[PDB]
Design a protein around this nucleic acid. Structure first.
Ligand code: DCP
Ligand code: CA
Ligand code: CA
Ligand code: CA
Ligand code: CA
Ligand code: CA
Length: 885
DNA sequence: ATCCTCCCCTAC
DNA sequence: TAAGGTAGGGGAGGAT
């Protein structure tokens, strides 16, 4: 269809109507016409009112700025001289320095006392000039009055849009009210957007509502999900230069609605009717594309979603329209003449990997590619639409041929395309993608768009700037300087390896690293030193503390740190999510709620990580190292306290043994053969141990393993009990059977062997199954699908890896192949070459009847993991004999 | 025969 | 702030 937004009130007028809208995105821009507070640059916020009206609100009069410390010079307070310095800067920086305001601030770096210092807040008429100013102060030669020649630390480096959001109290996905009489309409001939309401307000006059109570609701966002089909060549993934887009299916709904209010398919050529959806068929591809752009503009979606839309559908359409010279195509943002462009960049982090990105500006609309969401929030063996639809939704080549048939074959194609457009919307709603990300944007204060495009650091940065503003504190700008060394981390306890046929109680600290930062008041602002404690005559333990890393931090007596408060808020949110999880029946919903609480846990742990990131801009290893140091002492103290308490000479039946533990957990063999008693002792022990640490540190009994197969550090399995009557699952940590680089032959067999032993207590049956499997490998009875190994392609290599060698080979053969950051699928083929030269594309293998290295799969894939699980039961000799041959 | 490094992924 | 942290198994090969 294409229904448009509800019409505005007929008597609408800025003097009559407040405008309250949920802002979903914002960007820096220059406003045509009069300046405000000597600047023509604005932050344009886009969003939606409770009645479903779209809004572009220009926030005017907000000048970017930087802080530098006032010079240590007698003439520093002479206004005439400050005025002259401003003239000097205007001569140097394109006449873009507005003024200098003298303010009292303190650096976030350390405790020197509560005495604040004079800083110079230097305002600019356009935001980007702050960067050049910062550079000049840092490495330029601003030699006026010998004030900064030369040179100086600068403070509060942050992008202009976020600077405004922080200073105005605006978080992501938040509500803003524009009071009647306080804003003005953009005149018809000056309009730049297609929003129903295009207005301007001075930043001081907007009301930024905290996302709480009556202002924690969300606006009725219009969600558009789409999917395209292309008719491409046999053997070639479609290329925009040659292969037509032949269908675009669309579904549009209101956030949270039961059903979409628009369902349609744009087709090239004719297409027979589809019950419950509109069909818009076109004689030419060009027409279809232009109509689709017009459709977006008229429907005015707030969020554009789909599955792989980011890396495929969107760039493909842009590139296709360009190839076809449909030159007005790429204008479907909310800014009428702002072109959608592909920005090529690179994203890299340990958590998310390293890869090229192709982000497109669709100004004033959000994007939520469900493939990108699911990849971030879930660990799955496969992320194909089919795979994830079957997994989350319970769902169960010819394309070009269907296209070249008739109205009926194209209809068939259109149902497929419509379904592919609908699934992402089902996924978004069931996985609560929009709802949970709204929460995250609000809690951390970042724009929604940062969640999928950016990392954990920017969320920490936003929270830090917001807390610092509250206490007149500013943050020094430092250059990233990656270290060649990692600081010392956690203790992993030496395992007493083997098969335990008695209950093992697992105890672990709630939110360990955050609880350590809170208990011990660990923050940039509380960091001190020997020199200060003496100049100030502070008393150990009352006024400060010395960490096991040897660092001095002041106590809450002297200063409440800010990191503890940020962590407190994140843990509160997490606790709300956990309660929701505790209160929910449906297994699937609980799953989703489990990701929500995990996401918030990672956010809290990322505040610790931020302090340890030298690949980052505010490392403080005093904090990160003190945290890990405390952690090592705590697990040692926990192990010692459990062993000293629960022993025969204290009236217990057995001497408790800590058989294993990792970072913040201990696995305890109390000695009893009874499961409930082990769980009761585990609970009592955690309660006792918790009394030995400072609030809010807390040890809890987590679960019992019975039996428990401990193979090595970070390698074990066990039946996992949270009640003594029925076990929850067969839990596996670290084993090949839970690593996504195992071939499924190994994972499946390991899984079945573990089940037969731990659940069915049938070692004989497990061994018969392994022997059968060995026979199948050696007689080529294993489907190639179970032999495929997948590994991520790294950006660069020192040592040649089989999948990386194969990726280059594939490009040589086909002109294209896996890119950095893609998983590469391969099987090992037979032959005399080095292993890294013997990884091959499974399709290439099938096509050419190439023999797979069967013995390799036996000896170098199956054999070691299987021996490691059965040897503890049948012994090393038998386990090894089973593999001859 | 030991111990190291690069690599990939997972345990925290 | 472009990009949260460290420990460590085990495959595969390198240096003494
Ligand atoms: N992604 C992660 C996971 C863990 N850790 C560190 C900090 C954690 O506090 C500690 C223990 O890991 P847990 O998985 O037990 O995490 P928590 O104790 O924080 O959370 P929970 O309350 O779920 O046990 O390891 C981390 O820095 N980053
Ligand atoms: Ca698709
Ligand atoms: Ca726990
Ligand atoms: Ca924990
Ligand atoms: Ca743990
Ligand atoms: Ca090692």
């Amino acid at each position: 269809s294409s229904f448009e937004r509800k019409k505005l009130p007929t008597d609408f007028d800025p003097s009559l109507y407040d405008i309250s809208f949920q802002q979903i995105d914002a960007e820096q821009s220059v406003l045509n016409g009069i300046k405000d507070e000597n600047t023509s640059t604005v932050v344009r916020f886009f969003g939606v009112t409770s009645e479903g009206h779209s809004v572009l609100c220009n926030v005017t009069g907000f000048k970017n700025y930087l802080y530098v410390p006032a010079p240590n010079s007698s003439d520093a307070n002479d206004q005439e001289q400050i005025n002259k310095f401003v003239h000097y800067l205007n001569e140097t920086f394109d006449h873009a320095i507005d003024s200098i305001e003298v303010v009292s601030k303190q650096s976030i770096w350390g405790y020197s006392g509560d005495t604040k210092l004079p800083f110079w807040k230097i305002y600019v008429t356009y935001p980007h000039m702050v960067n050049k100013l910062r550079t000049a102060f840092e490495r330029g030669h601003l030699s006026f009055n010998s004030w900064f020649s030369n040179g100086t630390t600068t403070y509060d480096n942050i992008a202009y849009t976020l600077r405004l959001m922080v200073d105005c109290g605006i978080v992501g996905m938040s509500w803003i009210t524009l009071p009647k009489g306080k804003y003005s309409m953009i005149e018809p001939n000056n309009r730049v957007s297609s929003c129903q309401l295009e207005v301007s307000i001075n930043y001081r006059n907007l009301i930024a509502h905290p996302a709480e109570g009556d202002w924690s609701h969300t606006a009725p966002l219009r969600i558009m999900s789409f999917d395209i089909e292309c008719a491409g060549r046999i053997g070639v993934f479609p290329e925009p230069e040659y292969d037509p887009v032949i269908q675009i299916a669309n579904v549009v709904s209101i956030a949270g609605a039961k059903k979409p209010f628009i369902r349609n398919v744009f087709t090239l050529n004719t297409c027979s009717p589809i019950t419950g959806s509109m069909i818009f068929s076109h004689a030419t591809e060009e027409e279809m594309l232009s109509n689709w752009r017009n459709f977006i503009i008229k429907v005015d979606p707030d969020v554009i979603i789909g599955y792989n839309t980011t890396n495929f559908d969107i760039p493909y359409l842009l590139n296709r329209a360009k190839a076809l010279k449909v030159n007005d195509f790429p204008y479907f943002g909310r800014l009428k003449t702002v072109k959608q462009e592909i920005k090529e960049s690179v994203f890299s982090s340990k958590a998310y990997g390293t890869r090229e990105t192709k982000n497109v500006n669709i100004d004033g609309r959000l994007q939520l590619d469900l493939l990108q969401f699911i990849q971030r929030e879930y660990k799955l063996r496969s992320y194909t639409l089919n795979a994830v639809s079957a997994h989350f939704l319970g769902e169960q080549s010819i394309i070009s041929d269907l296209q070249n048939g008739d109205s009926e074959t194209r209809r068939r194609l259109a149902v497929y395309c419509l379904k592919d457009a609908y699934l992402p919307l089902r996924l978004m709603e069931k996985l609560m993608a929009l709802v949970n990300y709204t929460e995250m944007a609000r809690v951390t204060g970042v724009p929604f768009s940062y969640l999928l495009a950016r990392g954990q650091q920017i969320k920490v940065v936003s929270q830090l700037f917001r807390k610092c503003l509250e206490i007149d504190t500013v943050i020094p700008n430092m250059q990233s300087q990656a270290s060649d060394d990692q600081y010392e981390g956690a203790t992993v306890i030496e395992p007493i390896r083997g098969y335990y046929d008695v209950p093992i109680a697992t105890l672990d600290f709630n939110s360990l690293y955050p609880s350590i930062m809170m208990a011990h008041n660990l923050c940039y602002t509380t960091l001190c030193n020997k020199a200060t404690v003496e100049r100030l005559n502070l008393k150990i333990d009352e006024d400060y503390v010395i960490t096991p890393n040897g660092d001095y931090f002041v106590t809450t007596k002297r200063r409440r740190g800010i990191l503890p408060i940020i962590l407190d808020e994140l843990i509160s949110a997490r606790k709300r999510a956990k309660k929701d999880l505790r209160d929910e029946k449906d297994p699937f919903k609980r799953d989703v709620l489990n990701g929500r609480q995990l996401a918030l846990k990672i956010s809290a742990n990322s505040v610790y990580g931020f302090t340890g990131a030298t690949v980052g801009k505010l490392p403080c290893l005093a904090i990160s190292s003190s945290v890990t140091a405390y952690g090592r002492t705590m697990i040692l103290k926990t192990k010692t306290a459990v062993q000293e308490k629960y022993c025969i000479k204290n009236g217990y039946k057995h001497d408790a043994v800590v058989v294993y533990g990792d970072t913040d957990s201990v696995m305890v063999k109390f000695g009893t053969t009874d499961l409930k008693e082990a769980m009761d002792l585990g609970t009592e022990a955690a309660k006792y141990v918790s009394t030995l640490f400072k609030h809010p540190i807390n040890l809890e009994f987590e679960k019992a393993y019975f039996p428990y197969l401990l193979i090595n550090k970070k390698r074990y399995a066990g039946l996992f009990w949270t009640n003594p009557d029925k076990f929850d699952k067969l839990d596996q940590k670290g084993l090949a059977s839970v690593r996504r680089d195992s071939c499924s032959l190994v994972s499946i067999v390991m899984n079945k062997v573990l089940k037969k032993i731990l659940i069915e207590r049938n070692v004989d049956g497990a061994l018969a199954f392994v022997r059968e499997t060995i026979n199948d490998i050696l007689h080529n009875r294993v489907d190639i699908s179970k032999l495929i190994i997948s590994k991520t392609l790294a950006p660069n290599y020192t040592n040649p890896q089989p999948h990386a060698v194969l990726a280059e080979r594939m490009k040589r053969r086909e002109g294209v192949g896996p890119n950095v950051g893609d998983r590469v699928d391969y099987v090992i083929i037979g032959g005399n070459d080095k292993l890294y030269n013997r990884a091959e594309d499974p399709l290439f293998v099938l096509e050419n009847n190439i023999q797979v290295d069967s013995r390799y799969y036996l000896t170098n894939q199956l054999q070691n993991p299987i021996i490691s699980i059965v040897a503890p039961i049948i012994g090393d000799k038998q386990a090894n004999g089973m593999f001859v041959v």
